[PDB]
Amino acid sequence: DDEEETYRLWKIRKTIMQLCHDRGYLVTQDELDQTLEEFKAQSGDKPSEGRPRRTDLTVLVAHNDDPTDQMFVFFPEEPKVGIKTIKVYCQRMQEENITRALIVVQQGMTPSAKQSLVDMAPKYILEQFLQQELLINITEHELVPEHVVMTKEEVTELLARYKLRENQLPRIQAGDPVARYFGIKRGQVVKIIRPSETAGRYITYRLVQ
């Protein structure tokens, strides 16, 4: 140990910050290009590094939309996040007035805790991510095409040009890894740029439902 754990932590942090960058939140270029040596300078050993409190991120505010809107990232120490830690994070976000949170589980989560996270509060939106999936970026994969979230007016002009409805567009599950990666709400349509065999690109659209 003390060598693979810190590397996993650095790579998960890089993947999470790239995810936040893809969603359009405030991230600096220094955090974008962060080598393993920078994380070692931050913490070079496993006991020196704190998963529950040192790895937390709170500077995530929408540079495009609003500095008031804020996202938080949690890294629970225990492998199976209990409902106690969930309630602690909930009251912390209530005190800090943060309605968007992400959690990085280590090995799993209790079913009661899963149900609670599902229906803890309609105003507080919390996402779950396994640390195993976060070891690699889904967007950087060559098989996965480029996905861009569309706005309301873009979907409107699309349906006007194609003379369609929302329910007639192709569907995509909300539990899709890409859907959780982008945090897409139900009812939105995303454009997908498939790389063709030639120089051209195929443009398609999928409704998150």
Partner 1 sequence: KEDLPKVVVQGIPEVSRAVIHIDEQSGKEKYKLLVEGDNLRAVMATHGVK
- The nearer residue to partner 1, 3 or 66, going by C-beta atoms, is 3
HEC string of 41-100 equals HHCCCCCCCCCCCCCCEEEEECCCCCCCCEEEEECCCCCEECHHHHHHHHHHHHHHCCCE
Residue with tokens 């280590």: 106
Cα 22 to the chain's mean position, in Å? 9
Binding mask 134-163 for partner 1 (x = CB under 8 A): -xx---------------------------
Answer yes or no whether residue 4 interacts with partner 1 by CB under 8 A. Answer: yes
Answer yes or no whether residue 36 interacts with partner 1 by CB under 8 A. Answer: no
6-25 binders of partner 1 (CB under 8 A): 7
Distance CA 67, CA 78 (A): 32
Close Cβ partners of 96 (under 8 Å, ≥ 6 residues apart)? 58, 70, 72
Three-state secondary-structure class, residue 143:
coil
- The nearer residue to partner 1, 8 or 114, going by C-beta atoms, is 8
- The nearer residue to partner 1, 4 or 66, going by C-beta atoms, is 4
| Number of residues this chain uses to bind partner 1 (CB under 8 A) | 6
Among 176, 201, 204, 206, which residue's Cα sits nearest to residue 189?
A: 206
CB of 136 to partner 1, least distance (A): 5
- The nearer residue to partner 1, 132 or 151, going by C-beta atoms, is 132
Helices (H) and strands (E) in the chain, counts: 7, 10
Binding mask 106-135 for partner 1 (x = CB under 8 A): --------------------------xx-x
- The nearer residue to partner 1, 32 or 135, going by C-beta atoms, is 135
Contacts with partner 1 by CB under 8 A lie at 4, 7, 132-133, 135-136
